[PDB]
């Protein structure tokens, strides 16, 4: 009964029946096919016959055409045939998705989520097998620049060839075939798993969380597995192939990993989004358990019912998370700040900042386990990212364990937080904004920038030993780091290691933005900065001011006879609306700015 | 009874008696003398014998020594004698300021503010006359680089000479002497003025507001009156004189107005601060009138008692202010955005942004009245500043007229806002934060950045026709503007007109910061940016989150035996504290960044 299990604003908008959910899934497949058809045809460039495919997302999808062994010229007959067939598919899916199918519904009443998962195992088995067979007999782009059937081999431990990569797919087909049969007969009834059949939000949460972990493995694989046809190196090769437009080629020659790093940034960002949103759903499911006095006799066996009321567990556990953030942040940002002060003042002959030593630490544990040879850049960057992860987890674990009662609600005499969405409780006790579950969701989104930004600066080849460029007295440290980066870090395939800390790198990249794409990424930066600034007006403690001022603007529009425009100021966005929209736009406008950096 | 007339937090801190107020004034004079003594001796440079005076504020005070005809070498015998005598004065003033003087108090019970103003007229008369006489007989720096007595002349309409500038001071002495005598006998009892004797906050408000207007006249005079000894040109001359250290000289040769523009930025910023704080005091005085049912029988004659309750006056008046902001902002930012898009995309040969026309409008009204010959840079900059002023006035006029009742309090069924300092009323009606008088004070401080920033970018020679540098197709417009700027704009004495809009100018100035003062202004930028970011944690709708999380941090410190440090998290800053501190630091850290721009 989903309409009873969502926040108020969504009760009238959430698919409310088995059938409606299936229709939403169908229409979502229509969206997928439709995006493919749109982006092969539109948003390529101003003049594709001469400029090729220059614009983002289209470049990545044309890089796929290239990897498939098709003519990846802008608007080629292959590209158009692919785009038009996906449009056909989209229209058929949306068609079915917007008509009611009572027989389909009647059957869905008999389907369990365990059964659906069996079916998904064997659908995935089909896809994996058929794609292995397509590779095997019809081929993909081969080393000779021609479409080449891969053959089929199952020598898992021999060298990677097209044939064994085909075998890898067929093997996954077999594995999911046997696994689907096994679970068809045995079910998922084991304890600690039977409860999933009870609640769609629990299943949904787990899907999001595991998908987030898949995203992270994909980020790392896109850096490490750079084979030009069987890995993500097809994005390097496409950008300098015969199909690449002149400007894309010029950019890729000084930035070989250009398109790979755009894909990486997309998967980093989406992965963070599914991690935090998935945890929000699991926490919301738990909170509904805790608010349904009925929903307790089946879940009493789980420890979280107790932990969500135990103030000593809450403090010990959250304190451990905060320590896990504090220590690596202190080490990484403290070192990089000392080194920054040293780089800044290196020309000084006297005074407080003259003749500072550079802090230079390697990464012996990572090197011993994975075969890198890291420098202070990796040491600082990895501790800043690790710290950002634990930092982000502070609001995440509060969603999970603080959203019904906390030491604070007990301290101030409350029985329990009323629900998961209330924005505040007013000025009592010096102010109470954003103790609810959803407000900690937003805060985790905000904090997640401490993961995304250092990760991006690292991946794009910033010097992460310092916030500014390495000064001349410390050049030896940079040069040694550059040698072992080139010889031992797979990232050197995508990015040269510059001597520029992020602040200096911003100057250089932004300067380069004036002269690529006719300057457009400067327009992107400026517009994104404006919108980001405006979110302050929605996120600051100033909503009442705006609601009061909005009455003057509405009144003024009515006086002159344009009340249809004054309706824009019928009221200010509410606390809840302004926090949701402000967080969304604050977060995404930051990502737009980083996307500019990914375009040059 | 000031303790009854201030916000709660200040009742125990405000000087509570006539005598205590006088002592505070004495101690403030001690602060003035002490700053002079400190800054002539410390914070000059790391090694003054070789580097001279390099650091801000000290440079401006040494430029004064220079203008006085004294040896303005760092730590010269003249500088030390001046510094040590001002220290003596500070110690004597603070000495007297921290002892009780009962006879002085008994006499103060007999002093009125009208009497004090008579006395101030004749003290100012003394200062003006004695300084004219010092100039006349002992002199200031003369055109020959020597101290030269000016003589004394009263030829007001002849050419400006040192002698007539001395006469100007003596004449001001005479005028304030006659004016003090006149008011000694006639008083200030005229209607609409008698009420000032009633309330110290009304007098205080007016002093701040008029001082703000003086600040603005000083900003303009520092640009326009650039005479090298009798005007603010002494700051240009000092920076390239024999006393100037080598680096100050190197900077001034490419930036002649360096020190003048530092003084300008100081007076712009302080003037805005006194304007808004002065209006806050006047509004607070009015609000106390409206809250004292007694305080009405003497003020009923004033129209503001009515206006503060009249919802049609409130909407008409505030709507007029908003229009006065909307129209010039729309014109200035809309034009500059079109021109920005044109400059950005000027290299494009096709597509939506190719071959745009530059919007080019002059300033014929300003030219006809003041003798300028302005370009699109002046047209846009002046409308952006004018618009920023009306924008800032929106929260200012709400302080004055919305702080007891408003159309909003009537709409939601309230009798009246309880006081001037409450932070919010909670989530009712979609949220109620920052409708009080003090919260509109903060908002005016925030909004005032729309005055300060464009004014600074203009004064420092940014191209204000565009947010980026002028592109080659529009170079003719820049060159024509440069010719008439050089020949008709007095600002060219302080700043060359660059072809750089503020975004491009930021790149160039920040690049220059790496190589002046051993890079220190990069440290200033980075530290200021960090603090600015942190204010979000105090200004966002998130105070309850922090108070709840603070309990975990305090608990963790206590567990390990360092509860004296955990007291830092005894509680989060309250709504009221965090808004005051957040606004102060948001505002000042922005000013620090602009100060970096003023240093190069």
């Amino acid at each position: 009964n989903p309409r009873a299990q969502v926040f108020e604003y969504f009760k009238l908008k959430v698919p409310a029946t088995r059938g409606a959910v299936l229709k939403a899934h169908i229409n979502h497949l229509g969206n997928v096919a439709a995006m493919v058809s749109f982006i092969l045809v539109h948003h390529l460039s101003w003049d594709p016959a001469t400029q090729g495919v220059l614009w983002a997302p289209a470049t990545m999808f044309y890089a796929r055409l290239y990897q498939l062994g098709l003519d990846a010229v802008a608007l080629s007959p292959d590209a158009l045939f692919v785009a038009r067939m996906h449009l056909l598919a989209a229209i058929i899916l949306w068609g079915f998705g917007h008509v009611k199918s009572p027989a389909e519904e009647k059957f869905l009443e008999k389907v369990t989520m365990g059964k659906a998962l069996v079916a998904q195992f064997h659908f995935f088995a089909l896809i994996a097998t058929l794609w292995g067979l397509h590779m095997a007999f019809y081929g993909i782009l081969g080393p000779s620049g021609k479409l080449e059937p891969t053959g089929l081999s199952f020598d898992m431990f021999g060298p990677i060839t097209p044939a064994t990569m085909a075998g890898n797919h067929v093997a996954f087909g077999a594995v999911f075939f046997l696994g689907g049969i096994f679970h068809y007969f045995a079910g998922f009834n084991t304890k600690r798993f039977a409860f999933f059949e009870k609640d769609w939000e629990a299943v949904l949460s787990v899907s999001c969380q595991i998908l987030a972990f898949h995203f992270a493995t994909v980020v790392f694989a896109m850096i490490i597995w750079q084979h030009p046809q069987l890995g993500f190196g097809f994005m390097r090769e496409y950008a300098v192939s015969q199909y690449a437009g002149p400007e894309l080629k010029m950019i890729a020659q000084s930035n070989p990993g250009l398109l790979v790093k755009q894909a990486i940034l997309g998967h980093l960002v989406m992965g963070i989004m599914f991690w935090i949103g998935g945890v929000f759903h699991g926490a919301h499911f738990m909170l509904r358990v805790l608010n349904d006095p009925k929903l307790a006799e089946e879940m009493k066996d789980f420890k979280f019912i107790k932990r969500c009321y135990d103030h000593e567990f809450q403090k010990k556990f959250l304190a451990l998370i905060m320590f896990g953030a504090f220590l690596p942040i202190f080490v990484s940002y403290g070192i990089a700040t000392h080194n920054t002060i040293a780089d800044i003042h290196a020309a000084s002959k006297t005074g407080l900042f003259a003749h500072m030593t550079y802090i230079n630490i390697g990464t012996p544990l990572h090197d011993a386990i994975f075969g890198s040879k890291g420098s202070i850049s990796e040491f600082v960057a990895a501790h800043a990212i690790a710290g950002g992860l634990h930092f982000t987890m502070v609001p995440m674990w509060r969603m999970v364990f603080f959203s019904k009662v906390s030491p604070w609600t007990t301290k101030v005499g409350m029985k329990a937080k009323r629900d998961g969405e209330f924005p505040c409780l007013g000025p009592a006790y010096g102010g109470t904004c954003s103790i609810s579950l959803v407000d900690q969701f937003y805060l985790a989104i905000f904090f997640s920038l401490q993961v995304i930004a250092p990760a991006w600066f690292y991946i794009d080849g910033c010097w992460m030993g310092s916030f500014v460029a390495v000064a001349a007295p410390y050049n030896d440290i940079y040069q040694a780091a550059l040698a072992t980066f080139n010889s031992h870090n797979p990232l050197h395939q995508l990015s040269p290691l510059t001597n520029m800390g992020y602040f200096s790198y911003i100057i250089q990249q932004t300067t380069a933005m004036f002269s690529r794409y006719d300057g457009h990424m400067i327009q992107a930066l400026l517009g994104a900065h404006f919108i980001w600034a405006f979110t302050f007006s929605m996120l600051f403690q100033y909503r009442g001011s705006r609601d009061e001022g909005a009455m003057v603007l509405k009144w003024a529009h009515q006086q002159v006879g344009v009340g249809f425009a004054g309706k824009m100021y019928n009221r200010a966005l509410s606390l809840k609306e302004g926090k949701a929209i402000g967080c969304f736009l604050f977060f995404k406008m930051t990502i737009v700015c980083m996307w500019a950096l990914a375009m040059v | 009874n000031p303790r009854a007339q201030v916000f709660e937090y200040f009742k125990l801190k405000v000087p509570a008696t006539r005598g205590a107020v006088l002592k505070a004034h004495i101690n403030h004079l001690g602060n003035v003398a002490a700053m002079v003594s400190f800054i002539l001796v410390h914070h000059l440079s790391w090694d003054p014998a070789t580097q001279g005076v390099l650091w801000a504020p000290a440079t401006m005070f040494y430029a004064r020594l220079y203008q006085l005809g004294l040896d303005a070498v760092a730590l010269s015998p003249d500088a030390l004698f001046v510094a040590r005598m001002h220290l003596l004065a500070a110690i004597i003033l603070w000495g007297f300021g921290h002892v009780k003087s009962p006879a002085e108090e008994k006499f103060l019970e007999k002093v009125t503010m009208g009497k004090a103003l008579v006395a101030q007229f004749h003290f100012f008369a003394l200062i003006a006359t004695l300084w004219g006489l010092h100039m006349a007989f002992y002199g200031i720096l003369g055109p020959s680089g020597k101290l030269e007595p000016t003589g004394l002349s009263f030829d007001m309409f002849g050419p400006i000479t040192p002698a007539t500038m001395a006469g100007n001071h003596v004449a001001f002495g005479a005028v304030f002497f006659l004016g003090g005598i006149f008011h000694y006998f006639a008083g200030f009892n005229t209607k609409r003025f008698a009420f000032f004797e009633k309330d110290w906050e009304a007098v205080l408000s007016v002093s701040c507001q008029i001082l703000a207007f003086h600040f603005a006249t000083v900003v303009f005079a520092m640009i326009i009156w650039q005479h090298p000894q009798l005007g603010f040109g002494f700051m240009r001359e000092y920076a390239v004189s024999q006393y100037a250290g080598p680096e100050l000289k190197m900077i001034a040769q490419s930036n002649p107005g360096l020190l003048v523009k530092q003084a300008i930025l100081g007076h712009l910023v302080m003037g805005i601060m006194f304007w808004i704080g002065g209006v806050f005091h006047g509004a607070h005085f009015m609000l106390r009138v409206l809250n004292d049912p007694k305080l009405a029988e003497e003020m009923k004659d004033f129209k503001f008692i009515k206006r503060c309750y009249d919802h049609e006056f409130q909407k008409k008046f505030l709507a007029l202010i908003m229009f006065g902001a909307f129209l010039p902002i729309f014109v200035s930012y809309g034009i500059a955005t079109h021109n920005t898009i044109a400059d950005i995309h000027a290299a494009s040969k096709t597509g939506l942004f190719a071959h745009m026309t530059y919007i080019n409008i002059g300033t014929p009204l300003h030219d006809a009245i003041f003798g300028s010959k302005g370009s699109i840079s002046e047209f846009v900059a002046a409308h952006a500043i004018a618009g920023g002023l009306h924008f800032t006035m929106v929260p200012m006029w709400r302080m004055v007229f919305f702080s007891k009742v408003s159309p909003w309090t009537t709409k939601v069924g309230m009798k009246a806002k309880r006081d001037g300092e409450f932070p919010c009323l909670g989530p009712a009606y979609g949220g109620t934060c920052s409708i009080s008088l003090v919260d509109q004070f903060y908002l005016a401080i925030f909004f005032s950045l729309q005055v300060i920033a464009p004014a600074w970018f203009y004064i420092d020679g940014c191209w204000m026709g565009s947010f980026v540098a002028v592109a080659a197709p529009y170079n003719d417009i820049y060159q024509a503007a440069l010719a008439t700027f050089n020949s008709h704009n007095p600002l060219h004495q302080l700043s060359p007109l660059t072809n750089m809009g503020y975004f491009s100018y930021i790149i160039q100035q920040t690049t220059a910061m790496f190589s002046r003062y051993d890079g220190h202004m990069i440290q200033a930028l980075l530290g200021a940016h960090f603090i600015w970011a942190f204010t979000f944690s105090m200004l966002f709708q998130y105070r309850g989150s922090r108070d709840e999380g603070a309990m975990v941090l305090k608990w963790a410190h206590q567990q390990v035996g360092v509860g004296f440090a955990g007291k830092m998290y005894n509680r989060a800053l309250s709504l009221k504290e965090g808004k005051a501190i957040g606004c102060f630091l948001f505002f000042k850290m922005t000013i620090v960044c602009m100060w970096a721009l003023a240093m190069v």
């Binding site: 309706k567 019928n570 200010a572 609306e577 | 939506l352």
Partner: peptide, 25 residues
Amino acid sequence: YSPTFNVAHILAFFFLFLHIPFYFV
């Protein structure tokens, strides 16, 4: 990509985005 084409399409983006706040307010 003439001036009239380009102004027209800019105004199209403007009118379109302007309706986003109406959905909430």
